Structure 1
Amino acid sequence: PVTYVCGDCGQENTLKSGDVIQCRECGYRILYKKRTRRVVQYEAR
């Protein structure tokens, strides 16, 4: 489930097509990809 957020308000859009890049509740044109749930391993070095 790849979903995007709006960088102005924070409404979680769900784009799956390539129509336009725009929010619904604002009208602004900037969206971020949301970080889903997964584990990443690091060395403490």
Structure 2
Amino acid sequence: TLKYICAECSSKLSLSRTDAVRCKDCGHRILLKARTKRLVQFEAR
């Protein structure tokens, strides 16, 4: 599941369409994207 995080109260969240960029719980207009399980590789250097 694609998700976001409320930037004021850290409540997880997802928005699809005809959906305002707001926190459902508080009304914060700033949302930050969460990171999900996805592979990245690094050399240990």
User: What TM-score bracket applies, with the shorter chain setting the length?
Assistant: 0.7 to 0.9
Unpaired segments ≥5 residues, structure 1: none
| Match in the other structure for 2:39 | 39
**CA RMSD between the two structures:** 1.3
Length-normalised TM-score, structure 2: 0.80
Runs in 1 of length 4+ with deviation above 4 angstroms? Answer: none
Length-normalised TM-score, structure 1: 0.80
2:34 corresponds to 1:26: no
- State percent identity of aligned pairs: 44
